[PDB]
Write a protein that binds this ligand. Structure first.
Ligand SMILES: NCCCn1cc(C2=C(c3c[nH]c4ccccc34)C(=O)NC2=O)c2ccccc21
Length: 277
């Protein structure tokens, strides 16, 4: 058995957290328990009209398979005649992009801690044969205890039809049109650069100009960029996808976690550690 299927009437919906093209995330409090959930609401007619059923289905199926603290949890689903509802963890401290903008460049201790949690999360995800394909600060949420919770899985791939946010797109996605774990590792390199520098590495006036810089590996490190972090970024932002730290061709997550930038990191229990304030 499982809990009774929930329904709209079981909740007091509150504010809209955000709105997308095919869905809206609304904060809702379950009446019988007082628990707060971030409920993603999708209109069936619109999903069907735009051929998004594979994506919506993928979002639900991938999230159902995840069971790790660094990922948003899918607690339940239900639907009425017009909409689909996905009950998700409500990450109280919002997204990492907000935090980066709020504080600007992170010092080395904060960069290390959050980079380690993302690496640890990717190790888990890739270990299950799942690629995110749209990893960016906006999709990395912060829970009440300031640990990360990664979300946005509709565009994930379970091991060449989707391309994520321009600034985090890998060269292989612009040249060969194919999805690999290497693309998430490239995104990781961009994110580490962004935490240290305050902005992503490839920036320009429009998407075409950004893609142009990406394929030519046209970016540079600002002064004072932590040396070990720069070395790590240089080993992730590599045009040849098979040579990025973390790839099976480079012998996996072991060598990545062993990079000097992570020397003081205890990988086994990051989630029990107190995030640096
Ligand atoms: N602008 C946030 C975009 C990322 N995002 C946040 C969320 C989530 C949350 C949100 C938390 N704050 C938000 C602001 C805008 C939109 C969504 C949220 C949340 O608490 N839990 C989530 O999974 C989300 C869910 C599915 C797909 C993308 C999502």
């Amino acid at each position: 058995p499982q809990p009774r299927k929930k329904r709209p009437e079981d909740f007091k919906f509150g504010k809209i957290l955000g709105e997308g093209s095919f869905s809206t995330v609304v904060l809702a409090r379950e009446l019988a328990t007082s628990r707060e959930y971030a409920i993603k609401i999708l209109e069936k007619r619109h999903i069907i009209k735009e051929n998004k059923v594979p994506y919506v289905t993928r979002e639900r199926d991938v999230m159902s398979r995840l069971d790790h603290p660094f990922f948003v949890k899918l607690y339940f689903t239900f639907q009425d005649d017009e909409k689909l509802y996905f009950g998700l963890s409500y990450a109280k401290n919002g997204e990492l992009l907000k935090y980066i903008r709020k504080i600007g460049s992170f010092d080395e201790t904060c960069t290390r801690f959050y980079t380690a949690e993302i690496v640890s999360a990717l190790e888990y995800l890739h270990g299950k044969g799942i690629i995110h394909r749209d990893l960016k600060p906006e999709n990395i949420l912060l829970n009440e205890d300031m640990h990360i919770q990664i979300t946005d899985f509709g565009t994930a791939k379970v091991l060449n039809s989707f391309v994520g946010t321009a600034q985090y797109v890998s060269p292989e996605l612009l040249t060969e049109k194919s999805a690999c774990k290497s693309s998430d590792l490239w995104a990781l390199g961009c994110i580490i650069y962004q935490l240290v520098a305050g902005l992503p590495p490839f920036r320009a006036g429009n998407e075409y100009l950004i893609f142009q810089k990406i394929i030519k590996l046209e970016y540079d490190f600002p002064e004072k960029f932590f040396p070990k972090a720069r070395d790590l970024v240089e080993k992730l932002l590599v045009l040849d996808a098979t040579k990025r730290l973390g790839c099976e061709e480079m012998e996996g997550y072991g060598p990545l976690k062993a990079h000097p930038f992570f020397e003081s990191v205890t990988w086994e229990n990051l989630h029990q550690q107190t995030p640096p304030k």
